[PDB]
Amino acid sequence: QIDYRDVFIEFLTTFKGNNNQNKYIERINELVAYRKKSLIIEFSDVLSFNENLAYEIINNTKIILPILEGALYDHILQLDPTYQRDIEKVHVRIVGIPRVIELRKIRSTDIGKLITIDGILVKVTPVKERIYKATYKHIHPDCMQEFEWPEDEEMPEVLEMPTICPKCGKPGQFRLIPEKTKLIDWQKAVIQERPEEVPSGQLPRQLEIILEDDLVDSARPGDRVKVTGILDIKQDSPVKRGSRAVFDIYMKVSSIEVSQKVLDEVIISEEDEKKIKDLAKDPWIRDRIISSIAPSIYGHWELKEALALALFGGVPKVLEDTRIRGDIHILIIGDPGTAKSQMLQFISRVAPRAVYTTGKGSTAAGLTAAVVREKGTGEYYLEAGALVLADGGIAVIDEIDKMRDEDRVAIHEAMEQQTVSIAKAGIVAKLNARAAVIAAGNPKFGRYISERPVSDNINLPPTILSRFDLIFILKDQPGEQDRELANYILDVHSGKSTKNIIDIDTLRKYIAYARKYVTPKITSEAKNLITDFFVEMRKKSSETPDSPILITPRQLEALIRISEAYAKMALKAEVTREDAERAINIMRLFLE
């Protein structure tokens, strides 16, 4: 009925904008120049112009949007009439609308309404095509004319056919002519609820969504994504279950946005004061190290550090051959607990963006892969449900021992440049897993790692170990002797250490991890103290013609100079002096 073409063309062209310089005509220009069909308009720019526009769009989106889209194309042809032949209908898409509904709680009254959803994107199918509008011609003495099949609506997955056609008004033979038929690009993805949002009970919810036209290959699995879509249902036909609607859900995606750095940040607000009161000059390093330990002390002086360190940052990114392998990967192989990671892993479950995968791997990937069948008829999905879900976070993997035979060739990649190269002919993609890996594994027979070399003990890997930075063993504890206070620590007393606040449990996370606003490039005397260590360690080995394997600093000089520099990323802004001493120590301890 009522018509907003007026407001539309009187908006895009007349809108002032950030610089108070005409925008949305300029976006239009780039669009017509680059042969792209999408118009991304901010909702806050509309609400700062016309409010009623919002309500009508967002609630009547179903019918209103395509109207506005065609109405735009008209204005676009008369800026550049040669825009024909290349595009049929440009798209109008809205970013950052007010209604953002968690995929967990979804009203059944929200079908056909415009909404936004936060979540992580896990499974994605390959690019496919479909018929947008099919053009048929009727063979008989009463027709000999052409027509489009989905009148006033759109056609479905499986295409329908005669008998009756409007032209002549009879049944008969119908030939499809691809000459006039319009086609559309197609893809399907699965948004899983965020590991944070997930209550301890039940399981993360999932939503099936459909990426159309140029939205294809916009989002890659493992991404932290916000989408804006219009929900729908198809079914046709539901089989098997049961649970629970019974409505196949359909999200037709208008827009996707991958924009963020760490948006999982639980809060800053008041807590900025508290973590800054926590950056106090006191030996904050040692106490913070005492915090992750609790409540257990065994032979941990090295490990307490290595974990504290692993939880922290240090990621230089250079456009020429990106080299990071930061976010230090540590592996503790020990006999059956023995307290193992059954405790320390649980403490490394208190952390941001933390993926705990118990055993080899869950979800039929465990690191990454492409899958068969599974909804269905032979639909091919590409899904990686483990190590690339920890992107910008820690993947705590217990029992590496059981790792899939096929996967040990994938980690060579995902632990090196932190990408996964995948070509199964379903697609060729580089998945982004920047995750730190804190690992654990059983040895071959009980506790074997005293006499036998620490290699060959962990079974599967011969090399992957080289792709770890700090690997520790769990001492059998023959010589403990210290265990009076050390054990009674918490079995009665609340108090343990001089600080005794121990940064709580959450709070230690609200700073130590949740705070990487720090980017400490080390300089000056540090640069030297590490070097004199480099030459002395090297020459110490290379002086002996016996070839003692070189002590292997050559690649490691890289990741020591990650460790230290970014070990004392612990609320130290760019400042690095004696931090070196700590790292060079534990590495000289390690190399030998």
Q: Would you say 169 or 201 has its CB closer to Zn ion?
A: 169
Residues 6+ away with beta carbon under 8 Å from 588: 533, 537
Q: Would you say 174 or 448 has its CB closer to Zn ion?
A: 174
Q: How near is the Cβ of 135 to Zn ion at its closest, in Å?
A: 13
The annotation status of 573 as a binding-site residue, yes or no, is no
Q: Would you say 168 or 350 has its CB closer to Zn ion?
A: 168
Binding positions for Zn ion, rule: CB under 5 A: 138, 143, 165, 167-168
CA distance 84 to 32: 11
Please list the alpha-helical segments (H only) found in 407-520: 411-414, 483-491, 506-508
Q: How near is the Cβ of 162 to Zn ion at its closest, in Å?
A: 8
Q: How near is the Cβ of 261 to Zn ion at its closest, in Å?
A: 59
The annotation status of 108 as a binding-site residue, yes or no, is no
Q: Would you say 5 or 167 has its CB closer to Zn ion?
A: 167
Q: Report the DSSP pairing between strands 206-210 and 249-257.
A: parallel
Question: Each residue of 371-398: b (16+ CB within 10 Å) or e?
Answer: beeeeeeeebbbbbbbbbbbbbbbbbbb
The annotation status of 163 as a binding-site residue, yes or no, is no
Q: How near is the Cβ of 136 to Zn ion at its closest, in Å?
A: 9
Q: How near is the Cβ of 142 to Zn ion at its closest, in Å?
A: 7
The annotation status of 426 as a binding-site residue, yes or no, is no
Q: How near is the Cβ of 353 to Zn ion at its closest, in Å?
A: 60
For residue 103, which of 115, 114, 95 has the smallest C-alpha distance?
A: 115
Q: Would you say 164 or 239 has its CB closer to Zn ion?
A: 164
For residue 263, which of 119, 383, 104 has the smallest C-alpha distance?
A: 119
The annotation status of 339 as a binding-site residue, yes or no, is yes
Q: Do residues 209 and 229 make contact, with C-beta atoms less than 8 angstroms apart?
A: yes
236, 323, 373 from 247: Cα distances, Å: 10, 47, 21
The annotation status of 337 as a binding-site residue, yes or no, is yes
Q: 3-class DSSP state for residue 511?
A: helix
Residues 6+ away with beta carbon under 8 Å from 44: 96
Question: How far, rounded to the nearest angstrom, does the alpha carbon of residue 270 sit from its chain's CA centroid?
Answer: 28
CA distance 470 to 232: 50
Q: How near is the Cβ of 143 to Zn ion at its closest, in Å?
A: 4
Q: Would you say 21 or 163 has its CB closer to Zn ion?
A: 163
- Cβ count within 10 A of residue 353: 20
Q: Would you say 162 or 548 has its CB closer to Zn ion?
A: 162
Tokens representing 169?
């008004």
For residue 369, which of 414, 306, 312 has the smallest C-alpha distance?
A: 414
Tokens representing 525?
């005397």
Q: How near is the Cβ of 175 to Zn ion at its closest, in Å?
A: 12
The annotation status of 336 as a binding-site residue, yes or no, is yes
The backbone torsions φ and ψ at residue 358, rounded to the nearest 5 degrees and listed phi first, read -85, 110
Q: Would you say 104 or 133 has its CB closer to Zn ion?
A: 133
The annotation status of 125 as a binding-site residue, yes or no, is no
CA distance 111 to 92: 20
Q: How near is the Cβ of 173 to Zn ion at its closest, in Å?
A: 10
Q: Would you say 162 or 336 has its CB closer to Zn ion?
A: 162
Q: Do residues 258 and 223 make contact, with C-beta atoms less than 8 angstroms apart?
A: yes
- Dihedral angle of Cα 61, 66, 67, 69, to the nearest 10 degrees: 120
DSSP 323: -
Q: Which residues are annotated as a binding site for ATP?
A: 334-341
Q: Which residues are annotated as a binding site?
A: 334-341
